[PDB]
Amino acid sequence: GSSGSSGACQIFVRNLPFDFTWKMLKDKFNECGHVLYADIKMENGKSKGCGVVKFESPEVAERACRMMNGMKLSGREIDVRIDRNASGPSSG
Template sequence: MSAEDLPEESVMRIGKRCFVGNLAWRVSWQDLKDTFRDVGNVVYANVMKDDNDRSKGWGIVEFETPEEAVRAVNELNGVELSGRKMLVREDREDRDVKQYNRENGIPNSRSRRGGPPPRAQGRGTRAPPPAEGKSSGLQVVVHGLPWSYKDDDLYAMFEEFGAIDHAEIAYGWDQRSRGYGTVRFSDVDSVTEAIKSFDGYELEGRRVTVKLDKYA
């Protein structure tokens, strides 16, 4: 779908920024800018880094217009950059989207990048409380995560599928990631989409598996 195919309101709400995941460690903000300028006028590009100045494997690209952001998602999602296939989608923290929502009385979804996760605001069919020893149908276990991923990164990875109650990385006794985590959604439709989209996905050289949590 192109920007021309979208109603004006939809284009406005998409905003001008894209989230770019699964970046190779050596990719810099300049590499991002050079890659994304093929689809539009890039006014801002940044690769997020940890406290040790190492790439966290994701970044943000902002364009001059929402139409250019739509084109970036359509044309660059899944394209290889430095040996890895980029994950390109709209940035849910886009300030233009939030301003538009405020002006039109639309609640903004809250990301772990900007505060605590939303509670029980999901769309779709809610599952009943689980019986003892049975799955609620709302939680997934995600294996094969990059070792550098923290709770915020896991949350950002899955937030496009619906409201998330929590996203947690499992840590060992040494406080290092064990390479897996859990994500709990507020509706079962989001779980289905998350599994369909990310089960078997390659992320930073690791094969991600996403399965329904049978015990939560």
């Protein structure tokens, strides 16, 4: 158990193809449910290979996690997990 955000609808991704775009990232997680928020984190105009995906229901996310957990992308295993700290911007 935990005392974080009530309902894990958003998730996190890492180790994404340098070419991997937002559009693809979305439709990619769509398989699970209806993706709403989808973007690709970047630094000074440089892909980081990490993004996020938000769903309509909290249950879905919990699923998309494992469903995509270790999804060999273009020969690159990605790390999918549920985001517990999705409140506000995440950057120093």
